[PDB]
Design an enzyme around this catalytic site. Structure first.
Site, PDB file in Angstrom:
ATOM      1  N   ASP A   1       0.756  -0.873  -0.149  1.00  0.00           N
ATOM      2  CA  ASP A   1       0.123   0.247  -0.310  1.00  0.00           C
ATOM      3  C   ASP A   1       1.525   1.205  -0.180  1.00  0.00           C
ATOM      4  O   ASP A   1       0.147   2.420  -0.502  1.00  0.00           O
ATOM      5  CB  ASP A   1      -1.183   0.024   1.093  1.00  0.00           C
ATOM      6  CG  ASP A   1      -1.977  -0.551   1.278  1.00  0.00           C
ATOM      7  OD1 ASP A   1      -2.564  -1.385   2.669  1.00  0.00           O
ATOM      8  OD2 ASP A   1      -1.797  -1.926   0.725  1.00  0.00           O
TER       9      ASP A   1
ATOM     10  N   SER B   1       2.341   6.635   1.043  1.00  0.00           N
ATOM     11  CA  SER B   1       1.585   6.298   1.444  1.00  0.00           C
ATOM     12  C   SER B   1       0.050   5.960   1.375  1.00  0.00           C
ATOM     13  O   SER B   1      -0.618   7.029   0.989  1.00  0.00           O
ATOM     14  CB  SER B   1       0.895   6.167   3.364  1.00  0.00           C
ATOM     15  OG  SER B   1       0.641   5.334   3.510  1.00  0.00           O
ATOM     16  N   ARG B   2      -0.392   4.774   0.616  1.00  0.00           N
ATOM     17  CA  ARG B   2      -1.229   5.018  -0.391  1.00  0.00           C
ATOM     18  C   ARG B   2      -3.138   5.055   0.339  1.00  0.00           C
ATOM     19  O   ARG B   2      -4.125   5.376  -0.333  1.00  0.00           O
ATOM     20  CB  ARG B   2      -1.526   3.812  -1.371  1.00  0.00           C
ATOM     21  CG  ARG B   2      -0.345   3.958  -2.532  1.00  0.00           C
ATOM     22  CD  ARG B   2      -1.250   5.423  -2.849  1.00  0.00           C
ATOM     23  NE  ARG B   2       0.260   5.729  -4.120  1.00  0.00           N
ATOM     24  CZ  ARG B   2       0.991   5.284  -4.483  1.00  0.00           C
ATOM     25  NH1 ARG B   2       1.182   3.777  -4.302  1.00  0.00           N
ATOM     26  NH2 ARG B   2       2.368   5.879  -4.883  1.00  0.00           N
ATOM     27  N   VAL B   3      -2.729   4.809   1.497  1.00  0.00           N
ATOM     28  CA  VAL B   3      -4.321   4.570   2.364  1.00  0.00           C
ATOM     29  C   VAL B   3      -4.002   6.253   3.232  1.00  0.00           C
ATOM     30  O   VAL B   3      -4.908   6.909   3.265  1.00  0.00           O
ATOM     31  CB  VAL B   3      -4.338   4.073   3.487  1.00  0.00           C
ATOM     32  CG1 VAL B   3      -4.004   2.459   3.297  1.00  0.00           C
ATOM     33  CG2 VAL B   3      -3.162   4.329   5.110  1.00  0.00           C
TER      34      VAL B   3
END
Lengths: 136, 171, 235, 284, 117, 86, 117
Positions: B93, B118-120
């Protein structure tokens, strides 16, 4: 009051309206009030007194120049460095000497120097055109 | 959970596979090297309350469980585009990219902005940190290219002098 | 096959594939498991046939049709790799999303200069639509470098022949935004469905200097142009 | 060749593109500053020329040598050139124009003479064999009149001493950011403006001590000022030329990356194929 | 192992100082090439001289290389190494010529060599 | 890669030097002889020490050969000495 | 066969001069590609111009290629070509344009072709 310009070959040193000035002319000190008749003279190196409108005095240092008083304007064509004949002749002698002996000084541009050195080192032994078959 | 090197697990799998004569693939890694890391890292999950209640047969009701994973990968000469690194970058992620030019320059930890993400993102960040840290990342990403322009340019505009000095404080 | 069942009912269906590249890679893995000899860059020997036997079932039939929107990942950013090269043999259109166009606050973040479709031909889509799309394309790809000048030399360096191009390009760039019925949860504004006719009208207008009298934010997120005029009214 | 060499070359070309982008930015900012330092110089020359216009050939007039078109037996040139390379075709267009005109003058049997501002022209005309008698070099981007006093002193002295009969300044003219033009123009004997101070009939100056001593220094200071203005315009033109040269170089680097990457991808694919074929077809 | 907790702040500081001087001399090399040395600052000319001396002083004659060059070898303790490099970096030897440091051994031998030059 | 590892030295002949007129086209910055000065008469051992450095400094300065007009005379002497020994 | 002993000193020397010029031109093709041609020293521009003239002059029309270009074939004797290349290299044909050398026989045909541009 009248308008006054003190200008060098390089930059404008003063501008605006003035009440009077006092100058050390070549042939003796001198003072210009408004309406002064047209006049032209050289001036010696030294301070020129201004009193700006509302009486605000100040001194500007002039290394010499030429003063031109016109019907409603006055301009002082100041110059950047002491001028004479003993000096300008030394400058010309050195200008000849640097031409006889081929003396070349560096410029002062450290930025272009570093950029040029990085650009020369990056492009060296690159051989790209042998590799991408660009016919050229 | 922290996997200290998933490059070395890939190497050990390649060995124990070639020794069984299995047909290899790109860079001689076995055909299913992607499935090796995939079926591992897909166990790192957050699991909702109904799964937790069903699994444990009602013994726990309100809770949700989770398992975070921080796998470590090693790149030769900073080449992100090798086989295994670019496999794992397509499974996780985000990535924290530790840049050697920063580490040797004494910037430690050598986190590289811009190339790390960070993709969250803020959804996981605490509220105060989310509020106070909104600008830092892009500010540094831009400062570090401005500092690359700075070597060739002396006599910088004060507008950029402020930016450079501030980026340098924060760095 | 579920989409084929829907087609047989006479409907027009839409099939999404979450990544066709992984459909290729699963076939590579299976082929290696079966022990077959590898091929071009390690791929299976039957790459193009495994791709074709899928991509050849989604077509418009006399009874119905299946359209497909397929997300594609290009390995190593190489459009020559056998997998992208084989997939592009089948694609008709191509829309490229860009982080940039999103940063500027425009959604959907489609890039008009790299997006392409082989339906853009006068012989299929008509002459007016063709030359309208080509218009906006040329306007934007000039603006792309007028904005390069402006960065290094400042705005007032431009000729006034260009200060008009910039002001029209900015408005065209805004007018490509749209409110979705699905984005209301973010934008609040009601979603709009814009027919083709409306888009051709709007862009002919903006390009040929009409609507120059109203500001660019009258176009942003508006919908049709008949709504851009109203948003300019109440601005 | 091979993926690793080509990847190293791509890296180096990207670095080159960085450097040239930075040089373009720097040259643009220095162009702005130099064309402010240029505009700041006009008032002095513009008012001194009106003074000379009133005093030399106004409602009264004088017979100073610098004002009369005597017979040409040899010519002198003041050549302005950059101190730094990467400026494009600037210096060479200028020097070719200069050589083309000096060719005419020497064909007529009149000699020619040179004084050099900047080191590029110094080296060039040493290589060609022109007669250089005075030079100043290393002014860089900080021209100052007190440095120009020498070389122009030499030429004025040699003019009124009778050893020249015409004096030119040859330099580039900054016109528009994208265009700059080389020009040879005369500054002795004084070229005659169409400004009419027949309206100045209404008055005359008080001369302290006398007009003849003043006209001399006015003319000398005016020549020095025009040479300085030429130097400063040439500096702004150098900057505006290096800017466009570096812009072109950055675009060329960008267009070269896109070919190196095709070669690189082809090499990557070939290496994967050869390795995997050796393994598989070696086994069993 | 080059961190202050194991080598002590003295050694760590000397090592990073040397690295910094040489890393700066690498910057200055190309300005020296394009603009000549007489354009450097009065501090930069000192950095150049000290970097060149540090760069000489890292060389050493080996006991087993005596067969190659005939020069006798030297053994240098760590104490003398730190003392010499710190003295060089801190100007204590700005009065010696560069070659007094080449293949010298310990720092006292540089002052013994300079007298011979 | 095997025979470069077995032997005591390597003489590298390069086609760019061979075309540019340098014959024999030995590349000195990459050739090596591990026996070195032990295999030389002492006059040649004495005199080659200066050639090695004359060429090494030239290889370090070579990049500027295409900008040589810009260089300072202090390095131009090294560059045009390296060209002559080459 | 390209030896001073086999083809005489003049042929050999002209061949090696041609190779040296063309290789020197290959070395400059990257700097020309990046920075443009105006950044060459005043004599590297001369090298480049002569290299391009030589590139043109190696072209020749063939009797078996009339079907392609229409131009009649040419047969150039050896004595007649080492003279032309000695000329181009020594500088005695700088005045002619590049295209004066493209697809001609002897050098007299090049000086004669320049009259028509």
């Amino acid at each position: 009051t009248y308008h006054l310009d003190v200008v060098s070959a390089e930059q404008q040193m003063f501008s605006g309206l003035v009440e009077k000035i006092q100058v050390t002319g070549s042939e003796g000190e001198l003072g210009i009030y408004p309406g002064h008749a047209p006049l032209l003279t050289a001036i010696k190196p030294g301070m020129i007194r201004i009193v700006k409108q509302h009486g605000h005095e100040e001194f500007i240092y002039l290394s010499g120049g030429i003063l031109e008083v016109q019907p409603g304007n006055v301009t002082v064509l100041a110059d950047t460095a002491i001028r004479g004949q003993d000096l300008d002749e030394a400058r010309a002698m050195e200008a000849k000497r640097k031409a006889e002996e081929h003396i070349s000084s560096s410029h002062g541009d450290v930025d272009y120097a570093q950029a040029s050195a990085e650009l020369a080192k990056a492009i060296a032994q690159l051989r790209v055109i042998e590799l991408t078959k660009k016919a050229m | 959970i922290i996997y200290d090197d998933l490059s070395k697990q890939a190497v050990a799998y390649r060995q124990i596979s070639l020794l069984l004569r299995r047909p290899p693939g790109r860079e001689a890694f076995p055909g299913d090297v992607f499935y090796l890391h995939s079926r591992l890292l897909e166990r790192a999950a957050r699991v909702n309350a109904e799964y937790v209640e069903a699994f444990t047969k009602g013994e726990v009701k309100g809770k949700t469980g989770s398992l975070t994973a921080l796998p470590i990968i090693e790149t030769q000469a900073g080449d992100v585009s090798a086989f295994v690194p670019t496999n794992v970058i397509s499974i996780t992620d985000g990535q924290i990219f530790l840049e050697t030019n920063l580490f040797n320059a004494g910037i430690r930890p050598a986190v590289n902005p811009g190339i790390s993400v960070s993709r969250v993102g803020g959804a996981a960040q605490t509220k105060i940190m989310k509020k106070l840290s909104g600008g830092i990342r892009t500010a540094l990403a831009q400062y570090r290219e401005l500092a690359a322009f700075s070597q060739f340019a002396s006599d910088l505009d004060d507008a950029t002098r402020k930016q450079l000095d501030h980026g340098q404080k924060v760095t | 096959t579920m989409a084929e069942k829907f087609r047989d009912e006479g409907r027009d269906v839409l099939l999404f594939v979450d990544n066709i590249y992984r459909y290729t890679l699963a076939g590579t893995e299976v082929s290696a498991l079966l022990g077959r000899m590898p091929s071009a860059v390690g791929y299976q020997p039957t790459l193009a046939e495994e791709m074709g036997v899928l991509q050849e079932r989604i077509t418009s039939t006399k009874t119905g049709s299946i359209t497909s929107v397929q997300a594609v990942y290009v390995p190593a950013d190489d459009l020559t790799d056998p997998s992208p090269a084989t997939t592009f043999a089948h694609l008709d259109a191509t829309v490229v999303l860009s982080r940039q166009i999103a940063s500027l606050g425009i959604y959907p973040a489609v890039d008009p200069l790299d997006s392409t479709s082989r339906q853009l031909d006068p012989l299929v889509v008509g002459q007016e639509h063709y030359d309208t799309a080509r218009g906006v394309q040329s306007i934007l790809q000039r603006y792309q470098e007028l904005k390069d000048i402006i960065a290094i030399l400042g705005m007032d360096e431009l000729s006034e022949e260009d200060k008009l191009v910039v002001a029209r390009a900015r408005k065209i760039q805004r007018f490509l935004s749209q409110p979705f019925f699905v984005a209301e949860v973010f934008t609040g504004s009601p979603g709009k469905y814009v027919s083709l006719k409306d888009t051709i009208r709007g862009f002919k207008g903006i390009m040929e200097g009409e609507y120059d009298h109203l500001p660019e934010q009258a176009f942003y997120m508006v919908g049709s142009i008949e709504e851009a005029v109203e948003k300019a009214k109440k601005l | 060749a091979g993926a690793k060499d080509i990847r190293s070359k791509i890296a180096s070309v990207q670095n080159t593109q960085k450097i040239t982008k930075a040089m373009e930015m720097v040259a643009a900012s220095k162009m702005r500053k130099s064309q402010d330092r240029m505009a700041a110089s006009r008032p002095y020359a513009e008012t001194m020329r009106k003074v000379i216009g009133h005093l030399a050939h106004g409602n009264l007039e004088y017979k100073h040598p610098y004002l009369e078109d005597r017979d040409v037996k040899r010519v002198g040139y003041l050549v302005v050139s950059t101190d730094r390379g990467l400026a494009g075709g600037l210096n060479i267009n200028l020097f070719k124009k200069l050589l083309a005109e000096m060719k005419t003058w020497t064909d007529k049997g009149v000699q020619a003479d040179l004084a050099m501002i900047g080191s590029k022209g110094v080296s060039f005309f040493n290589s060609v064999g022109g007669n250089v008698v005075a030079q100043v070099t290393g002014m860089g981007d900080n021209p100052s009149l007190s440095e120009l006093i020498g070389p122009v002193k030499v030429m004025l002295q040699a003019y009124d001493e009778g050893r020249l009969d015409k004096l030119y300044i040859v330099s580039n003219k900054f016109i528009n950011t994208m265009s700059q033009v080389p020009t040879i123009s005369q500054l002795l004997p004084l070229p005659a403006s169409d400004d009419d101070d027949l309206k100045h009939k209404s008055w005359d100056y008080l001369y302290e001590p006398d007009p003849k001593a003043l006209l001399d220094t006015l003319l000398r200071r005016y020549v020095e000022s025009q040479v300085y203005q030429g130097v400063v315009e040439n500096l702004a033109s150098e900057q505006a030329a290096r800017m466009v040269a570096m812009k072109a170089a950055t675009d060329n680097g960008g267009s070269l990356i896109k070919e190196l990457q095709l070669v690189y991808n082809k090499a990557r694919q070939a290496s994967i194929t050869q390795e995997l074929t050796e393994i598989v077809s070696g086994a069993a």
